[PDB]
């Protein structure tokens, strides 16, 4: 499963468990903060340093990465394009596709970026309410796990993918 089902080679599967799209949200709990467009305590930025390891294919990703930080991984800035960090080469082509034209298939050698972050969540977020993660841009497709458990999948590199993490989080480190 997940390796079985090549969702990245099926135009009928463009997402799994993704929430509905919507206009920009901040979930203010104060009217005046909403009016003045000031920061919201309910909207948290995960633009910090993550852990990153590069692979030549999803099949080369070790199964331990779901549970544990890989010691081979580097700490990098997110958001980022990994070619800008030197892991593989950026490609400039105009009309001709950068891959063989054979829809829906992509090359077996499919560069894979394994990202991870250990983080805390306020206790109050676990008692009540809904906590979602939002990826404003992932190029070109991705699976997501929270605390070792599979959450969902997304496509389209230029629109946000959102997923409910309420059932997944725990007290302390996630």
């Amino acid at each position: 499963v997940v390796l079985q089902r090549r969702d990245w080679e099926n135009p009928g599967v463009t997402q799994l468990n993704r929430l509905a799209a919507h206009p920009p949200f901040a979930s203010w709990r104060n009217s005046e903060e909403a009016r003045t467009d000031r920061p919201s305590q309910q909207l948290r930025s995960l633009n910090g340093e993550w852990r990153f390891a590069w692979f030549p294919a999803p099949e080369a990703v070790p199964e331990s990465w779901l549970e544990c930080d890989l010691p081979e991984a580097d700490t990098v800035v997110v958001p980022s394009n990994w070619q800008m960090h030197g892991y593989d080469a950026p490609i400039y082509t105009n009309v001709t596709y950068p891959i063989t034209v054979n829809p829906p298939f992509v090359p077996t050698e499919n560069p894979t970026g394994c990202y991870s972050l250990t983080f805390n969540v306020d206790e109050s977020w676990l008692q009540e309410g809904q906590t979602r993660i939002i990826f404003d841009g992932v190029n070109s497709a991705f699976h997501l796990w929270c605390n070792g458990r599979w959450v969902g999948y997304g496509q389209d590199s230029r629109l946000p993918s959102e997923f409910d993490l309420s059932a997944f989080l725990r007290a302390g480190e996630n």
Binding site: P23, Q83, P90, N94, D156, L159, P160
Partner: protein, 211 residues
Amino acid sequence: PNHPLWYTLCDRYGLYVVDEANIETHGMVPMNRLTDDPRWLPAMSERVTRMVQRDRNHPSVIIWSLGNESGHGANHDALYRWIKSVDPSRPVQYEGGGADTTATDIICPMYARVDEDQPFPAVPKWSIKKWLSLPGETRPLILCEYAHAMGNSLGGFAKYWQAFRQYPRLQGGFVWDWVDQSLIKYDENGNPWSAYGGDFGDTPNDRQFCM
């Protein structure tokens, strides 16, 4: 669709925006192979519909675009009509398949010249002055792309603006484009230099056409 802050800034500084779906299938033969295929309608629909759902409240957005360089397929017509139903407040444009198809409210050619016709079979690029008055044609004309500013360029730019000012229904266009897509590289001395297609071992590539 852009980084969300782009629309905020456009709202606040004041720029008119064309918000464009993340669909381009330029490399297909013919260009509409996927976009005329109903099996690709679901994937295409999300790219249009999730954009509208995100950006529909931004005043800076004045036009919706169905994407770019994907020929003209039936999926375009379906998605054109979807937007027209869901949001009557904005015209829908799309250039693929000859710039003046049933999937666009605006004649929006790319690189149509001011006076000279380019009568390519199936997808001609008429003189923009002539395009407006073709039998039965009533729509405004605004080039989605014109004046390819590659290197030492923009020769004949003044000729566009004279035309735009003389003809009411010629309502301008969008220069191609804003900024060189060159990437910083470093020599043995650690000195930075501007790099283009081919400079990363990338092959096949299209060299300085990224600039």
